[model samples]
Every structure is written in structure tokens, then in C-alpha cells.
Target: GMADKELKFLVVDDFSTMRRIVRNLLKELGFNNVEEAEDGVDALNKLQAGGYGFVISDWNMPNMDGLELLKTIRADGAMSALPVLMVTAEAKKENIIAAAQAGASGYVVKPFTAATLEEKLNKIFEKLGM
Candidate 1:
């Protein structure tokens, strides 16, 4: 199993409050090592610098949106298999499918509960046996 220390979460959102909230929620869920990115471009830069175990990104952003980020990550030889969870306001079936097709590990609609986050994280970890 992957150790807790092996888990480092990158929260990407334009809103500082949202990033803080997500980081705090992950911390409450026993994931204390979390980082933040203002947008997809920042996220990619951080990832390139290494140590990002998972990515929780917002779907909408001013530049380099979540879909673009997902595609970029998947296309990269090094980060292709990294887990990416889209945390966004988008809840339509088509959007979800598009995210999944783009290689998102999971999708979470905004204003979600800690329980919902737990469920999604658990499912992803189970799949990866982490």
C-alpha cells in the first residue's frame, strides 16, 4: 500500500478560498501534505518540478483550463498515469464523460460534502491499491 507520506495533493483553483477549503478538507480526511496552484498553468509548473501525487483541479479557469491540463498530463510520458480529480461546478453527463475520456481519475461537483470527497478518494485509492 502507498504510505500517507507518499500522498501529496495539488489543489488547483483560481479562488484562494476554494483552494484553502479543499486543502483543509483533505487535511481533515487525513491528507495533510497538500499544495495549491492558482490555475492549470501553475499546476503544470508544480508537477514538472515534481512531488505531486494527486491533482484536484477546477474545471474553469482564465487560462489553461482543467480539460487542457488533463490532456497535457495524459500526453506527457512522465505524468500520464497520475491521478487527477476534477472538482468543479460542471455536473452534466456529457461533461463528466468528457472529463473521464480526457483521463480524469474522478469528478466531483462543487459545493460537495466531505463525505463525498471521502467516497471519491476511497474509490480512487482502491483502484490503485493505495
Candidate 2:
């Protein structure tokens, strides 16, 4: 796959623990270029600052949620093509459909394993022909 270890990743979640966990998991997957955002608003700020290649975000958060962030990214021409992967506890079919409809590159339910994250990342990379 075209999984670049150097690809900059923004991990957005309200919880610091979750952000750290996700960052550690990405590191384990050989992706060391990772940053964290406490919520959707923070994520958007960092994104606008530029240089993010990928995003891993939680669904529920203060200020803005993952779905809202996804929609905003899609609506923004400059970042519309950015790959967003939802990593959240929201496992409802409706939620998955919504994320897909909103232009998320992939989704991963919480309590997921490293293998699952790796698979999802590879699948997104494959789909994008990256």
C-alpha cells in the first residue's frame, strides 16, 4: 500500500487520552507524523494552517463533531480531497452511512484493534489510488 510513514496526520478527539492512544496506535503502524486536536474546531484550525495529509477523528465532541468536520472539509475546495477516517464509538449503520455520504474516506468503530486501523488505512489508500 501507499502508507507513508511521513504523512502528516491530525487526530481529533475531545479526550486527551483518546488522542494519545490514537497517536500511539498510529506510531505502532509506522506513522510517526501525528498531531492532536481536542475537538472539531481545533482540528479545523490546524487543518487550515496546512500540511495535513490525513485525519482521524472522534464522532462526539464539543464545538464540532467528526461528522461536521467531515462536511466542512468536503465543502472546502482546498481540503475537499483530504482523506478523513472516522475513528469513533458511533457504530450505528446510520452513522456509517452519514459519514460516507459526507465524504469520509473511511470509518472505524471505537475499541478497535491495531489491525483494524491498519486495514482501514490501507483500504482508504487503495480507494484513493494513493
Candidate 3:
């Protein structure tokens, strides 16, 4: 099952194309409460407004990449428990491992299919009891 339909999602990608692709995928599955961020900086700032339940972030951002955003999110007690799902082309084992170390709730490699996103997302939702 999916998380709450009302969960506020932030899609962070330097590329507009990837951002909407992810957002549209979520919308296809009834997740319409989403916002877009150009990079980690914008993500962080947008998140400061609070109530962001999840983040779909791209790793290759020009300003403060996704890993840094994850680190920053984990660094703050108020935001540490927030779920962050990394969306990137970096499919190396080490990249995924590093994302896990940085407190990513889940990860979906780039060029992903809809099933891949749903699987990883549902895994996170289940584990988090969302």
C-alpha cells in the first residue's frame, strides 16, 4: 500500500525534466500534494516552511547535492526523522551505501521505472509505518 495520499512530497532535482517525471509518477498514483525544488538549497529552504513528509531528491545538483541535503536534514533534530528518498543515476554500490549512511529513508536509481519507485517507496512506507 502507499503512504497517506496527503503526504506532502518535495521533488528536488536540478533538472526540471527529472523533477516532473518523479512528481508526475506520484500524481499518477494519487499523490498530488507535491512541490518542486531546483536543488538542495531550495529544498532545504522550502522544507524550512515545514510539513514536508517525503523528499525525492536527485544526487547531481549544482548547489548542495542530495547527499548534502540528506546530511543536513539528518543533522537537525526537528527534521531528522523525515523521510528522504534519493533519486539518482549513481547506481554504484558505494553510492547507495553512502546514501544509507547519510540517513536516506530509501533510494531509487535514475532512469527508473514506475514499479521501481513504488517498490522502494512502499518499502520505506512500510518500515516507517507510514
Candidate 4:
């Protein structure tokens, strides 16, 4: 029996090109269900409306960056358990630690390869028993 491929994903980034790149990459990875948000505020708005299974967000943006978004998601009971993967240009250890402390499910530095993304997704799926 085949499992359902019905999960909706949110991709949050201020750059349209980055959002398009991510959405395309996920599509190539067999995930066609995706939505885009310009920043954390936009993402939070969509998330509150419900039905998002995963969030892959960029760390820096003009309004409410990824770290704030992660913190907000964790603080809300309704969406606390949501899986969030932080994607950032910053490769600082301090930033990674902060994301972990804020409850990010995974972290990926920018300029990542397709293999890296796949590995992160697989790891998160395994951790969440998906």
C-alpha cells in the first residue's frame, strides 16, 4: 500500500528567488505540496490558519526572522510540535545552538547541496516517526 503524500509545506524567505529555488527543489524531491511566505510574519499568519505539515524557513529577513518564528511556533500549543528546519546563510555555531534551543527540528547552512537537504529531511522524518 502506498502512503499519502498530502503534507503541506511552508517555505519562508524574503527573497523570491530563494523561495522559488526551494520550492523547485522540494518538487524534485517528490514533494509537490508547497506554499511561500515572504517573511516570518507572513509565515506565522499562514501557520495560524492551520494545515501546514512542515516549515523550511530562512534565518534572516526584514520582518520577524526565522529564530523569532521558531520561538513563536514553540510557544504556541497548537503548533508547538510542528517540524521546522532552519536554513541560513550564517554558519555560526552560536546561531545553530540558538535555533536548537528554540526548538528547530533541523538546521541547514546556505549553499547546501541536494544531498544535504535530503539527509536533513530523512533525519527529521526518522526523528518524528514519519
Candidate 5:
């Protein structure tokens, strides 16, 4: 389980503060190889460059949203199997269902605790056998 500590992570959000907070949270979880992307389009560019093992993204963004990102990742042959966890302010039931339908590995509502993040990460890892 601890082997995932070395995995690279991309945190995608329009808000700089939210990105920083998520990055810090990942660091606190013992994952240091984390990067930031301002929006879904930026995230796609970075993901195309390769090396990211996990993604944590916000649902609402300027250029593209997390659902589109997740769908694109699932459609792309290169990153189709990548684990994407949505950490967003969107709390609607339809939003969660749509994310799941789009192949999100996990979803965590905004204002989440570190404990919730850890739990969701662990659950995704376990499900994916990472």
C-alpha cells in the first residue's frame, strides 16, 4: 500500500488556492510528486506529457470541466486506465452519477477533510489494485 507514495499526482482546479490546498494535502499524505493544472485543458496537456499516476480534479472550471476530462482520459488510449478522483464543490446527486458514468475512479465533495481524502484515495487504490 505504501508503494503508492512514489506515484505522481496532478491536481486540477481553477482556483490557485484550492490547487495549493490539495497539493499540501497530498504532501501530508506522503505523496510528494504532485503537480498542478489550472483547468481541464491544462490538465489534458500535462496528462499527455505523461508520468502522472493519479488525478484529483475540480468539477467546475473555465475551459473544461472534470467530467469532460474524465471522459477524454477514458477515451484516450494512452491514459484510458488512469485513476481520476473528483474533488469538487458539486454536491448534486446527478453530478456524482454523471461522474461515475464518465469513469471517475472516485468522487469527494468539496470542503472535504484530510481523512476523507485519505479514505477515498485508499478505496480507489484498493479497487484498482494500485
Candidate 6:
């Protein structure tokens, strides 16, 4: 969204299949052009070079947890305000609340209904005017 060309969406998850799962889900959920990152390491690398408008990241990962990843992105001025969303299965409400305070653009739980994901997706996009 920061460049002239259409920005690319990023999905960050360490689990191999989980990446594809989100890929198919959000790929068609209004964000057509998308890319994938296994861990925050790769995700951050991708962001450094790419025009990343939206980041949908997993709650937990080995290399770098998603919450840490979110904070990392915000610390950088260039990608500071990128719309970052989270999907958590193992974390409790406190974890979600913590991330919320830390500036997650949006979030949803695992096994989330497509209906809910899309609804939240639209609201976040609307909030950022994307």
C-alpha cells in the first residue's frame, strides 16, 4: 500500500500445511495477490523488500512468535502501520488482549468460521481504509 503498485498480502505461519490453509482462505477473501512466510524470520525479510499492506500471521511459531513479529513490524517506520491480523488456537483471551494492546490490526481464533473471518477481515480493511 506504500508504493505505486498494488501491495501484496502476506500470510506468516510456520506449519507447512497451515500456510496453505490460510493461503486458500484469505487468498480469495478479497485479497487476491498474496505471499507466504514460514516464520517471522522469513516474513520480516519479505516485508523488507515487498509492499506489504496486510499481514495475517499465526499466533505461535518456532523461529519467532507472531506477537513478537507484530511488535517487530510496528517498530520499523516503513512498515509500522501495516494491517496485522492474528489467528490463535492455543492462546487464551489474555494473550489476545495483550496483542490487541500491542496493536494487532485484527484477530480471530483457530477453526474460525469462514463467515467470521471474512466479517472481521472486512472490518479491519475498512478501519484502515484499505
Report the C-alpha lDDT of model 3 over 11-100, residue by residue, as the tens digit.
999889888899888887788999999988999999999998888898889979999999999998788999998987768898889999
List lDDT for all candidates, in order.
Answer: 0.87, 0.89, 0.88, 0.88, 0.89, 0.81
lDDT tens digits by residue: candidate 5, 1-52: 2566989999999999999898888888889999899988999999989988
Score candidate 4 by lDDT.
Answer: 0.88
Candidate 1 lands at a TM-score of: 0.93
lDDT of 6 by residue, 1-130 (tens): 2222345779898887887877676645555678999888999999999577789899888879899999999899999899898988866889889898889998887776556777877788788776
Candidate 1 residue pairs that clash: none
Q: Which 10 successive residues of model 4 have the least lDDT summed?
A: 1-10
- Return the lDDT, model 1, position 63: 87
Model 6 worst lDDT window (10 residues): 1-10
Please give the lDDT score for candidate 2. Answer: 0.89
For model 4, how does the per-residue alpha-carbon lDDT over 5-81 read when each residue is reduced to its tens digit? 56788999999999998887787677788999999899999999999989999999876999999999999989999
TM-score (C-alpha) between model 5 and the true structure? 0.95
Which runs of model 3 end up more than 4 angstroms from their true locations?
A: 1-3
Q: What would the per-residue lDDT of candidate 2 be over residues 7-121, giving only the tens digit for each residue?
A: 9999999999888888888888999989999988999999998999999989899889999999999999899999999987758899999999999999888887788888899
lDDT of 5: 0.89
Over 4 Å off, model 5: none
Clashing pairs in 2: none
Q: Any idea what lDDT model 1 has? A: 0.87
Candidate achieving higher lDDT, 1 or 5: 5
Per-residue lDDT value at 129 in model 3: 85
Backbone collision count in every prediction? 0, 0, 1, 0, 0, 0
